[PDB]
Design an enzyme around this catalytic site. Structure first.
Site, PDB file in Angstrom:
ATOM      1  CD  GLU A  71      -0.891   0.414   3.793  1.00 42.73           C
ATOM      2  OE1 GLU A  71      -1.465   1.520   3.766  1.00 42.73           O
ATOM      3  OE2 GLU A  71      -0.832  -0.302   4.794  1.00 42.73           O
ATOM      4  CG  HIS A 100      -8.985   5.048   7.569  1.00 40.13           C
ATOM      5  ND1 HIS A 100      -7.673   5.319   7.861  1.00 40.13           N
ATOM      6  CD2 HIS A 100      -9.650   6.191   7.842  1.00 40.13           C
ATOM      7  CE1 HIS A 100      -7.540   6.586   8.267  1.00 40.13           C
ATOM      8  NE2 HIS A 100      -8.747   7.132   8.246  1.00 40.13           N
TER       9      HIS A 100
END
Length: 108
Positions: A71, A100
């Protein structure tokens, strides 16, 4: 210096690595990044947290034999990390999240 959804996605697919403004979390901690203090842009001006392995245990992203997910934070300028993340596989599938890791959308 790229930190947008398109900028990073395109960069990864073409150059097979994140742009130079990214650093992993252990790197930033080493550099004096203190999460609870929201000070990244204090100790590492112009840098974003990126390149760490993302486990995928909620199992929301597409899996596969030998496929790894990583990520990177997108749109970060300063203060506490935001909620935007670009997710990219070992085989360059690109997804994004703006809540998130709650939901993901394929962008490449």
């Amino acid at each position: 210096v790229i930190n947008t959804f398109d900028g990073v996605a395109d960069y990864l697919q073409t150059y097979h690595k994140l742009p130079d403004n990214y650093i992993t979390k252990s790197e930033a901690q080493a550099l004096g990044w203190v999460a609870s203090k929201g000070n990244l842009a204090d100790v590492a001006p112009g840098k974003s947290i990126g390149g760490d392995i993302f486990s995928n245990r909620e199992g929301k992203l597409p899996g596969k034999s030998g496929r790894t997910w990583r990520e990177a934070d997108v749109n970060y300028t300063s203060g506490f990390r935001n909620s935007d993340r670009i997710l990219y596989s070992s085989d360059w599938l690109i997804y994004k999240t703006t809540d998130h890791y709650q939901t993901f959308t394929k962008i490449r």
